[PDB]
């Protein structure tokens, strides 16, 4: 079967975690433990197709920055998460999305932005202004909730649909 290498990325505490393990799990990690870097490896059907999805959950804190360089060459899409709640963490996307670029050496790299904590009210990043920055890079925005798991499964299985489109 075709298995996916997925790379779920973005700042701290933005939700990758939750998000991660809300798809391969089914719950909603409450608390705030900080990745180093741990993967995940679920066979799932996306589109009739048995697929295994490798998920590589990485580190949104500055400090293992370093690490970078190796999961981008692996990963075949990225997940760029960010938290409608916390404009810094949106801002710091192009970061993410410049060193794949770099790294992939592409500008045609699987990805999806991902707006996570939507369940929250204190919104400071619109819904507009993801998809602005979605279309720039030419990828796909979705709104997601690890919480309530509102576009969880989208958000993921999107991934692979880009991933397919290349
Ligand atoms: N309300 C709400 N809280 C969320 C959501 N996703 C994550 N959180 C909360 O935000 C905190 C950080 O989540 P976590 O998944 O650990 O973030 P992370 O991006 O993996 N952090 P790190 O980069 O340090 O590994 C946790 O308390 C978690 O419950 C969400 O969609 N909604
Ligand atoms: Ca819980
Ligand atoms: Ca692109
Ligand atoms: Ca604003
Ligand atoms: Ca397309
Ligand atoms: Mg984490």
Request: negative net charge; proline residues 2%.
């Given at each position: 079967?075709?298995?996916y290498?997925?790379?779920v990325?973005?700042a701290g505490?933005?939700?990758?975690?939750?998000?991660?393990?809300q798809?391969?799990?089914?719950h909603?990690?409450?608390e705030?433990?900080?990745?180093?870097?741990?993967?995940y490896?679920?066979?799932?059907?996306?589109?009739?197709?048995?697929?295994?999805l490798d998920?590589?959950?990485?580190?949104?804190?500055?400090?293992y920055?370093?690490?970078?360089?190796?999961?981008?060459?692996?990963?075949?899409?990225?997940?760029?998460?960010?938290?409608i709640?916390?404009?810094?963490?949106?801002?710091?996307?192009?970061?993410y999305?410049?060193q794949?670029?770099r790294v992939?050496?592409?500008?045609?790299?699987?990805?999806?932005?991902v707006?996570?904590?939507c369940?929250?009210?204190?919104?400071?990043?619109?819904?507009?202004?993801?998809?602005?920055?979605?279309?720039?890079y030419?990828?796909?925005?979705?709104?997601?909730?690890?919480?309530?798991r509102?576009?969880?499964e989208?958000?993921?299985?999107?991934?692979?649909?880009?991933?397919?489109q290349?």
């Open positions: 079967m075709t298995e290498k997925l790379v990325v973005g505490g933005v939700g990758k975690s939750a998000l991660t393990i798809l391969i799990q089914n909603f990690v409450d705030y433990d900080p990745t180093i870097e741990d993967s490896r679920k066979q799932v059907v996306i589109d009739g197709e048995t697929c295994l998920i590589l959950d990485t580190a949104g804190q500055e400090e920055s370093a690490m970078r360089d190796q999961y981008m060459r692996t990963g075949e899409g990225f997940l760029c998460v960010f938290a709640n916390n404009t810094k963490s949106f801002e710091d996307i192009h970061q999305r410049e794949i670029k992939k050496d592409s500008d045609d790299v699987p990805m999806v932005l707006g996570n904590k369940d929250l009210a204190a919104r400071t990043v619109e819904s507009r202004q993801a998809q602005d920055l979605a279309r720039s030419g990828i796909p925005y979705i709104e997601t909730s690890a919480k309530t509102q576009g969880v989208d958000a993921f299985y999107t991934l692979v649909r880009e991933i397919r290349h």
